[PDB]
């Protein structure tokens, strides 16, 4: 249920292309092909950036016609 995401380095945005860029530290061991909980980490990290992206998008000039 939390809609906010805290990160050491702030995520940068290119909303004209619906894109977000995350420069935060990635761990090799968390993402290695032998790590079983690999895809859980990929999705979880992606979910955070998508959340931040959607937040930024919904703060743009907006109207529910």
């Amino acid at each position: 249920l939390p809609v906010t995401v805290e990160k050491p380095i702030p995520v940068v945005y290119d909303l004209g292309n619906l894109a977000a860029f995350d420069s935060n530290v990635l761990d090799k061991n968390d993402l290695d092909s032998s790590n079983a909980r690999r895809e859980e980490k990929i999705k979880s990290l992606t979910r955070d950036n998508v959340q931040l992206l959607i937040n930024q998008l919904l703060s743009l000039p907006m109207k529910t016609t």
């Binding site: 292309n17 761990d27 993402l31």
Partner: protein, 225 residues
């Protein structure tokens, strides 16, 4: 003033096989409707002779091209090619690892074809490293589709996620890039709580040979009005 949507042409090489073709089909689906597939195999070797790729680019009006090739030295090789004025702009070999998953490996959900995808790039090198900067530029250019001033929130359906397999130090081999595609689900907490469901395809790209444009071509292809 902006150009038309870039069209993608998928070309099976001489050494293309069924498995690599399955990868083509599923990845080409993300590019619908701005996409064409060739059915026959063509004897193309980009880093030996670029002429045939420039020919196909002009005669099919496709500024984005993907060649499918496989040997034991370069297995499941996808060579991504961009053109400017039907001349080669840049090239990069991205080889798919054996741990790939197709659309058949994920539960089929409802999916509206032709919606503007969202992007998330994970990895600081995407902004500083010459190789990864090209990859970010490539996949943004390839899949973004229609440029528009107007966005329907209801059209925010799926995200294309690309993650570098861990941070790395200068000198070490370049880490793979992890291509993932998720569908969005939103719930009420105004801001919604976002969750993701993977829909595929799932691809781990190994970086191969690279071709970069000359300063003169960059000047023309990035000229401002």
């Amino acid at each position: 003033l902006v150009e038309n949507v870039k069209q993608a042409l998928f070309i099976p090489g001489q050494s293309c096989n069924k498995n690599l073709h399955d990868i083509m089909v599923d990845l080409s689906a993300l590019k619908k409707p701005d996409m064409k597939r060739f059915n026959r195999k063509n004897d193309i070797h980009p880093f030996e002779d670029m002429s045939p790729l420039e020919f196909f680019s002009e005669k099919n009006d496709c500024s984005l091209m993907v060649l499918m090739t496989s040997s034991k030295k370069r297995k499941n090789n996808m060579t991504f090619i961009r053109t400017f004025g039907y001349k080669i702009y840049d090239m990069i070999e991205l080889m798919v690892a054996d741990n790939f998953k197709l659309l058949s490996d994920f539960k089929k959900l409802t999916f509206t074809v032709g919606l503007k995808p969202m992007f998330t790039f994970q990895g600081a090198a995407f902004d500083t490293h010459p190789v990864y900067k090209q990859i970010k530029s490539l996949f943004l250019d390839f899949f973004r589709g229609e440029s528009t001033d107007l966005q329907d929130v209801a059209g925010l359906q799926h995200v294309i996620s690309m993650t570098i397999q861990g941070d790395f130090q200068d000198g070490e081999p370049l880490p793979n890039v992890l291509f993932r595609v998720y569908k969005l689900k939103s719930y009420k907490s105004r801001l919604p709580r976002i969750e993701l469901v993977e829909i595929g395809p799932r691809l781990d790209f190994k970086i191969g040979r690279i071709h970069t444009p000359s300063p003169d071509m960059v000047t023309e292809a990035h000229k401002k009005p």
